[PDB]
Subunit: 118 residues, 5 copies
């Protein structure tokens, strides 16, 4: 199976965004975070972030940000692939999330979203 694609939430909507600049561990960073809803269902796995110069995958900062902003605009159904327990900055983890955003795929029905499933 694809490394880092094993943990996801499906048929969610991106209902909040954050974008900022921040010094972390003595390095100048950019970050963004997505916040999620699942229609009217309560979701606890509801935030994930990406940082330009830290993480398991530094590539794709601008493309992932633009992709997140696209689905915030449409409110469309997506699946979010993420990795738990990534961010080591304790102030960032408590403010935003520990989770690193890995991929965003669309869902065309209540049962199908693109990408691998477990």
């Amino acid at each position: 199976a694809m490394a880092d694609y094993d943990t996801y939430v499906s048929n969610v909507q991106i209902n909040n965004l954050s974008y900022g600049v921040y010094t972390s561990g003595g390095k100048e960073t950019q970050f963004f975070c997505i916040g999620l809803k699942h229609g009217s269902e309560a979701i606890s796995i509801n935030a994930m972030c990406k940082v330009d110069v830290y993480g398991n995958h530094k590539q794709g900062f601008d493309n992932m940000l633009n992709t997140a902003k696209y689905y915030y605009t449409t409110g469309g159904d997506v699946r979010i692939y993420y990795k738990e327990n990534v961010w080591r900055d304790p102030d960032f983890k408590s403010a935003f999330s520990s989770r690193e955003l890995i991929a965003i795929t669309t869902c065309s029905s209540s049962s199908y979203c693109m990408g691998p499933t477990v």
Copy 2:
């Protein structure tokens, strides 16, 4: 004829998208994949991908991604040119596709799309 333009599907719509980051073969990659339908019907050749640091044509990652997102938004009729049997990562081919996306052109009628035919 144009090299790599011999294999295409016409009058389709991009009805799904994926964008992600992924380690493949020791390289840090970005990728995106488009999912297709043919009007009211599903089609069997229905996913094509592009990878920033692998493939027959590594250029144009951001422009092809922006172009794909554009037609996902409009739902317009397009022709997709693609190349078969490209991606060699077995986990990736199984989750997404083995096909490399080459070009996207528009269709102004049920019978005409821009670009060369065979």
Copy 3:
């Protein structure tokens, strides 16, 4: 007059767009092409293209692509400046066009588009 601004069509609409990647003449390229509307016909006329690593003006590939996509979306009337007889790859010229896209300007009326004119 401005070099490369002598040849244009005014008050046209872009009704088709192509974007691709392609190996031409030993180089890896990106290109896009616009097709122009002719009455109610589906087939476009006067297609014009831009290539990132070939042409009289290699600069501005992404900005010209985004400008072309913009007017394809709005369907607005534009003036297109282009250079005839540029592309030499025969397969490309047969598939798309020989013309290089130089500039796109708006038309605010049936009578006025921005940019220089010739008589």
Copy 4:
């Protein structure tokens, strides 16, 4: 707590935007500045700016500009994190403010915006 995240205004709207190029202190700059409202309420903390080659955080100019422009388009409620007393150019400070823009987060309700509140 996150350094530079202690000062913010919540549930505001970006109702004006400036973008320009400018020589400041012998350096060629770009800048943008956001103007804020909060519905009908009189606010005094209502302008924040970012400069490409000056400030505590020079990274993220284009991404922050595009983020500010998006919320100006939607008129949606946001939280603005900012740093007071940053700009030293007296002419710039008089025309806009001394405040450096740090982050923009969305507000999904009258009581919630993403990001830390301490």
Copy 5:
């Protein structure tokens, strides 16, 4: 006062836009030009341009272009800051404009636009 911010036109709309490529002085350039109106009136200062590799401020070409395109799309009221007598190639000035685009700010009402204003009636 902010250098290069002394001449502007307020409460205008961008109602035309040009983008192109052009060779000048041995350099390959990109440029764009905006056309303006003041509601239903034509104005005297109605065009201004930015060039990627010429001008007093070469930075910000893409950001300025995207900003101008945005306001052309929305038709919203803006203030345009510009500098006179920059483009001195007569065929470019005849085709487009002599003025360099410096900044674009919004006007949220008929009475307010963002950005610096001159000190007084004589710009002392």
